Design a binder for this molecule. Structure first.
Ligand code: GNP
Ligand code: MG
Length: 157
């Protein structure tokens, strides 16, 4: 079963690091601004095509490539950046202007720097009818769950 999932978020929230942890089982402390990557993985039988997008902000205009043919979305913000959490709301609105959406507050490992509480992202997700979780691209355990969830959620809907 072929399925296309688009990862969206503000820049530097860890979109690429999430996708790379999930697919290659590695985390890099480096940084490379994404133009567009695609990561293919077989999740057990679904052929998952992850479209890892360029970071976006409150003014950006999302192209058709992000809306058409998309079976599901992973919307990522960073728990250490409220600005990124504010942008993910805009990005959602632009999106609705129905698919499974999993909302991910990433970089939960960086606890001392947290700005956005779990209960806060959970409520936002609830307001959309989306599933919510937190993660760290540094933990394979935490990262797998995001992507197995969005697939289970597509098989659901
Ligand atoms: N501690 C920690 N660092 C993270 C986490 N996720 C990403 N990072 C780090 O944060 C930086 C941003 O990661 P990146 O994956 O490039 O984010 P992005 O959303 O893909 N950026 P862009 O929109 O520019 O493509 C990187 O230097 C990476 O090492 C995480 O969960 N925890
Ligand atoms: Mg990226």
């Amino acid at each position: 079963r072929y399925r296309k999932v688009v990862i969206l978020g503000y820049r530097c929230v860890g979109k690429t690091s999430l996708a790379h942890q999930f697919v290659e089982g590695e985390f890099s402390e480096g940084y490379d601004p994404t133009v567009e990557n695609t990561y293919s993985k077989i999740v057990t039988e679904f052929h998952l095509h992850l479209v890892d997008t360029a970071g976006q902000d409150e003014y950006s205009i999302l192209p058709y490539s992000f809306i058409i043919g998309v079976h599901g979305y992973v919307l990522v913000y960073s728990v250490t950046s409220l600005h990124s959490f504010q942008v993910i709301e805009s990005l959602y609105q632009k999106l609705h202007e129905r698919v499974p959406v999993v909302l991910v507050g990433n970089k939960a490992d960086l606890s001392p720097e947290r700005e956005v509480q779990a209960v806060e992202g959970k409520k936002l997700a609830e307001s959309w009818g989306a599933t919510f979780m937190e993660s760290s691209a540094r933990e394979n355990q935490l990262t797998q769950g995001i992507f197995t969830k969005v697939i289970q959620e597509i098989a659901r809907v």
